[PDB]
Amino acid sequence: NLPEHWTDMNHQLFCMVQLEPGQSEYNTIKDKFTRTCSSYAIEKIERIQNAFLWQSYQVKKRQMDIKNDHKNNERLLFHGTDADSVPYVNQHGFNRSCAGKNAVSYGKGTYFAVDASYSAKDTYSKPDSNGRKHMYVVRVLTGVFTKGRAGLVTPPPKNPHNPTDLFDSVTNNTRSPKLFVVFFDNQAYPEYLITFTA
């Protein structure tokens, strides 16, 4: 069930794997980051191998793939974090109950950015005592989405006369999405941790 490219974790359930510059895997993430964060410098990129988070995420993805009509349900997005949160996210993923209020709120959930520049703001990727900033690269089940609203604690219904049939996520703008908000556990898999500095 675990991806074949992962390092052997010899019965362990969790490993952070340091990537090598020059490998396609490192270079693709560096390029995705530098597209909007060219003024910052990457210290390192770690692949997050969390068996339990992966299993629960892949179950949710299979369900969304069944429910939705041949939709690309998954986007690769960014999430800036403070150093104090990194151990919890690595082990347990993204908990909406711990999320800050966003400067522009489209609901009470976990926020993910299309552009690394957004997540690179000190408000999200707070510099630690050594000047290191931390950003996850995250597989997010955006599914079918609509423009969010500050009051939401779950995604809104697609149809007001069927209140239980929900959008998968919300966004700031359906025409030009720059952020997505998810409201359920195991809808986002933290795949890489970028450590970076000015």
Next chain:
Amino acid sequence: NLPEHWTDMNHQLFCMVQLEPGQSEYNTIKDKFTRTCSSYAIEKIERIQNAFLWQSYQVKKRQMDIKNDHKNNERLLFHGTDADSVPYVNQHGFNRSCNAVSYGKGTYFAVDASYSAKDTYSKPDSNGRKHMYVVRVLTGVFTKGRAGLVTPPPKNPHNPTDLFDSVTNNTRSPKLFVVFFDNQAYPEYLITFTA
């Protein structure tokens, strides 16, 4: 991998199945309720057949069975719901983001049906009908809760990310459990009843 006791769903993924009174399954669930709620009249008991919620719950159960290195992680508990919330719970299960919550900001489950039978939880609808779930809950290894928790405490603060599975009001004689994650609770039956 849907349970044998489920009945065929004609290739659908969600069904509420009304149980036949006086058959073994109805009798078992009725007895669990009447242990503390024998003064309440049961209108019906429905089996909740939600393939997606069951899948996600069974994955969490398998994980908790590995993590705890032992397999007594599940309890059968009660939860009272207002009528307006029953369709959401049937389809999406319990949501901590949706009464006093003095043991933490999670989903609450009662050991005794009598606790969930309070009108503050199982709010009577226009017709006096009250609604209570019988819930499979992954209580796992638990500790005493306290106000304002957003996750269970660590089992050892040397390792702040290795958490208890749930919290309770009283570890020696628990009457309520709180879980803080989606898919730690599977709503298995819905009881419709009157005072």
